[PDB]
Amino acid sequence: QGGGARALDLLRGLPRVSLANLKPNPGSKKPERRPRRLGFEGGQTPFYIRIPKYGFNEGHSFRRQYKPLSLNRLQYLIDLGRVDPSQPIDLTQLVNGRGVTIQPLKRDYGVQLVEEGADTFTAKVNIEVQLASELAIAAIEKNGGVVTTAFYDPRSLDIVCKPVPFFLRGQPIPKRMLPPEELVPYYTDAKNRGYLADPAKFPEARLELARKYGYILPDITKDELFKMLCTRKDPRQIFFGLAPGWVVNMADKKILKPTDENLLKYYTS
Amino acid sequence: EFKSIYSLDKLYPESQGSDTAWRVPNGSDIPLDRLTISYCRSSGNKVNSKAEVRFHLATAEWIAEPVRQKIAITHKNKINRLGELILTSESSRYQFRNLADCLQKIRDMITEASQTPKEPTKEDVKLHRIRIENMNRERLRQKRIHS
Amino acid sequence: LTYFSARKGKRKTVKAVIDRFLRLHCGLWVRRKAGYKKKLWKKTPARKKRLREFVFCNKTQSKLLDKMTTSFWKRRNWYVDDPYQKYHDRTNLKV
Amino acid sequence: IPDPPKHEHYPTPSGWQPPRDPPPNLPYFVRRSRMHNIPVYKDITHGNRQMTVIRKVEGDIWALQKDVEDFLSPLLGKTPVTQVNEVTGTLRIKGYFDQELKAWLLEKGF
Amino acid sequence: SGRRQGIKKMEGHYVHAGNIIATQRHFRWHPGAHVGVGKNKCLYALEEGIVRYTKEVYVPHPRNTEAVDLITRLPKGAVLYKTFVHVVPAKPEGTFKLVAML
Amino acid sequence: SKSKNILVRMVSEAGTGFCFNTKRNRLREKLTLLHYDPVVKQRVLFVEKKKIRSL
RNA sequence: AGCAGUACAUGCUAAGACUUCACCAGUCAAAGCGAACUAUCCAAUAACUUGACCAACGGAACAAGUUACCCUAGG
RNA sequence: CCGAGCCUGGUGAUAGCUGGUUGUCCAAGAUAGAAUCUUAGUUCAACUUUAAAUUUGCCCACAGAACCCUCUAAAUCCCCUU
Ligand SMILES: [Mg+2]
Ligand SMILES: [Mg+2]
Ligand SMILES: [Mg+2]
Ligand SMILES: [Mg+2]
């Protein structure tokens, strides 16, 4: 039964551990050996040159990337208390719980919710993502949860993922930009639950998913958590409860708001 | 709260409501309480799961009586000894997609039944020889000489 | 190949390789056939079809391409609606 | 890392289950990871050497080696090749048995 | 300055459908049972099975003017022979499996 | 300058724009063919339009 | 041998193979759909595409004589 | 020693081809091919090292591999058993 206690018991008999009797673990050190252009074939056209050019990687640096978050991962995070379903779940809460890692410098534009694990997803959540699949949306809605797709720009995404580093810069909270023209259709469509989509169409789109996948659309209005479930941030709001232009003073635990008319008009525009 | 120029209220004035986006619209629907839905999870070898939907066709109130008769003859091979029409789908890993495939199959059956002018189409190669075999079989039929 | 750049002391990527090859995350390299766009009039339909295929490189070529590119080109990417998304991971490969 | 919230029904939807209380009385103990998961990990080298590693083993590791050999020998049909690292408290097994070992260790109460 | 042509699959070897049995400039081995011919006279397996080489009586197609002229000029009683390669199907087309108990 | 055969581009009369190069004798009138047209998925008249190269 | 005849589904797609061999390139092909049913880069182009006797033919984008005044190199 | 001075710096300049390259022990360890302004060199091949995974490898019974005239013998390919 004793394996750790036996090793410590053996230590009592042996000489005092000191700098004179240490050694590295066997195999951790390779003995040094003591003596005591690439891609050129010697004249012919190199293989990597004689192959024709094709735009496999053309524009790779400008392609948008989305980290995949599965319902399995989301359910696992909720089960272990790392994401709390009783509050709105956004990028900040996902990042804070170490559920996903976002690299804005690597052209990450947010998280894309994926349907893997839909069969076993049981949590009721209000979650904001950047992209969601049809099956992933149905899995959340079938449990009484709300899923919305919102756009963050590179600057906004950096701030939302790591709020504290931003606050230490000493800049006022910026207003997040609108999606580019190409994305505008996606985020103004109720089928995607876009944050810029008409709220009136949503009921129709929500019902269509329930019919297609064979579940009864629950009435979240009757839910006790309805107020939280319908909580959403303004399209220009990076953080819940914090408006653009505000300055966060973490040292004094205060928030500074500008009263200048020109500044207020700019931030609210 | 904070409201910008792009707030949903300003962008959709006529859609301003607490329940505007979350109302349950009361309202060809297929009742999901009448159907019997079973799931057979993957073992190991197929990766795709299996979803089975079955209901008693003859006593299906939702389907029209003329339709139930047409469905019975057209899909007799699916109806079992108990008179239950059995539909199965295993085309997807997820049970949601498999169930959606079964429900879509039920909808096509009801639609196809109501469309009386069934489209004439070229027969499958299997049917072509069976037609010739059926034709020769009648050629061998004889008449009772004295009756 | 530059193993130590003059200004950063870092290995450099051979851009000639980026122009011509696609690297799947599993370590496979995809390329085009040489001359797929040239002299089609004198090529049979069967020859033209295999000339427009996307083919894999052999082991020796793949290891050479790996050395000529830095780690950035080997990272996993999550492009939206990527046509080669499914090919990045191998399946049922015993080896 | 937050402590897992208490649930009414175990296992949870994702399959997680807490360690048994009180600890199972055995000659060895397998501690959970900092994320409250069973420390069984797949490992591979040379592109073809599939291996399973059991970490955070306390007590008589050799007792765990015999228990693992008795458990895995029916499935393989032979005694599993293993390495016992007494210093680090690690049991290394040839082949992938991470899923089977995780369920096996969960039943014991670790 | 040489090329490789000849029997890829010897007698008794197992072949899969599409395997190239032999390559030839001219007809040295003729297609037998379940052996296809390519444009270049390549012989390939049409079924999975064992390769067999036999000697069979040769009868050309009536519209093969060149070959018909040869056989018509042969002395009566003389039969031409050629080497043929065959594939003996190893597996059945399919089996009947119980799928439902309605 | 001169060749026995000429490489010329045949354009479909359907107006889809599908064209295929074809070989014809130099001393011939403009060629018209019923070549198959993928865009319309059926055979369609093809009209000789432009000389591409001389063989 | 650096071609010709003569067709215009030399359409599309796809198992499995061959190959001068190393690479590049090259070659054959069931089933299926539809028919019939007997070198690299470069330069021109809307596109589809085309073009170097690059013959030193794995082709540097583009350059000769002469030195018995010779200079340097090793064998 | 000026067929173009000398000095310093660029400069540890480049190429080419020689020469040299410093304790011990154990294990494995000798191939003879293709392209190239390339044959005094190189890179893909041949052989060769270490580690790893897995299952056959070598030797080889019968049967089998074309006519066209084969010098046609000595042999080859394939190949269970052993
Ligand atoms: Mg590892
Ligand atoms: Mg066919
Ligand atoms: Mg030795
Ligand atoms: Mg043998």
Curated annotation (Swiss-Prot), chain A:
It comes from the Eukaryota. GO terms for molecular function: RNA binding; structural constituent of ribosome. GO terms for cellular component: mitochondrial inner membrane; mitochondrial large ribosomal subunit; mitochondrion. It is found in: Mitochondrion. PANTHER family: 50S RIBOSOMAL PROTEIN L15, LARGE RIBOSOMAL SUBUNIT PROTEIN UL15M. This is Large ribosomal subunit protein uL15m. InterPro entries: Ribosomal_uL15, Ribosomal_uL15/eL18, Ribosomal_uL15/eL18_sf, Ribosomal_uL15_bac-type. Coiled coil: none annotated. GO terms for biological process: cellular response to leukemia inhibitory factor; mitochondrial translation. The keyword Secreted does not apply. It comes from Homo sapiens (Human). Disulfide bonds: none annotated. Residues 1-16 form a transit peptide. Keywords: Mitochondrion, Ribonucleoprotein, Ribosomal protein, Transit peptide. Belongs to the universal ribosomal protein uL15 family. Component of the mitochondrial large ribosomal subunit (mt-LSU). Mature mammalian 55S mitochondrial ribosomes consist of a small (28S) and a large (39S) subunit. The 28S small subunit contains a 12S ribosomal RNA (12S mt-rRNA) and 30 different proteins. The 39S large subunit contains a 16S rRNA (16S mt-rRNA), a copy of mitochondrial valine transfer RNA (mt-tRNA(Val)), which plays an integral structural role, and 52 different proteins.
Swiss-Prot record, chain B:
Its main location: mitochondrion. This is Large ribosomal subunit protein mL62. Methylation of glutamine in the GGQ triplet by HEMK1. It comes from the Eukaryota. One of its GO terms (molecular function) is peptidyl-tRNA hydrolase activity. GO terms for biological process: mitochondrial translation; mitochondrial translational termination; rescue of stalled ribosome. Belongs to the prokaryotic/mitochondrial release factor family. Mitochondrion-specific ribosomal protein mL62 subfamily. Down-regulated during the in vitro differentiation of HT29-D4 colon carcinoma cells. Component of the mitochondrial large ribosomal subunit (mt-LSU). Mature mammalian 55S mitochondrial ribosomes consist of a small (28S) and a large (39S) subunit. The 28S small subunit contains a 12S ribosomal RNA (12S mt-rRNA) and 30 different proteins. The 39S large subunit contains a 16S rRNA (16S mt-rRNA), a copy of mitochondrial valine transfer RNA (mt-tRNA(Val)), which plays an integral structural role, and 52 different proteins.
Curated annotation (Swiss-Prot), chain C:
This is Large ribosomal subunit protein bL35m. One of its GO terms (biological process) is mitochondrial translation. The keyword GTP-binding does not apply. GO terms for cellular component: mitochondrial inner membrane; mitochondrial large ribosomal subunit; mitochondrial ribosome; mitochondrion. It is found in: Mitochondrion. The gene is MRPL35. It comes from Homo sapiens. The chain holds residues 94 to 188 of 188 of the full protein. Belongs to the bacterial ribosomal protein bL35 family. Component of the mitochondrial large ribosomal subunit (mt-LSU). Mature mammalian 55S mitochondrial ribosomes consist of a small (28S) and a large (39S) subunit. The 28S small subunit contains a 12S ribosomal RNA (12S mt-rRNA) and 30 different proteins. The 39S large subunit contains a 16S rRNA (16S mt-rRNA), a copy of mitochondrial valine transfer RNA (mt-tRNA(Val)), which plays an integral structural role, and 52 different proteins. One of its GO terms (molecular function) is structural constituent of ribosome. Keywords: Mitochondrion, Ribonucleoprotein, Ribosomal protein, Transit peptide.
From Swiss-Prot, chain E:
Keywords: Mitochondrion, Ribonucleoprotein, Ribosomal protein, Transit peptide. One of its GO terms (molecular function) is structural constituent of ribosome. It comes from the Eukaryota. One of its GO terms (biological process) is translation. GO terms for cellular component: mitochondrial inner membrane; mitochondrial large ribosomal subunit; mitochondrion. It is found in: Mitochondrion. Component of the mitochondrial large ribosomal subunit (mt-LSU). Mature mammalian 55S mitochondrial ribosomes consist of a small (28S) and a large (39S) subunit. The 28S small subunit contains a 12S ribosomal RNA (12S mt-rRNA) and 30 different proteins. The 39S large subunit contains a 16S rRNA (16S mt-rRNA), a copy of mitochondrial valine transfer RNA (mt-tRNA(Val)), which plays an integral structural role, and 52 different proteins. Belongs to the bacterial ribosomal protein bL27 family. This is Large ribosomal subunit protein bL27m. It comes from Homo sapiens (Human).
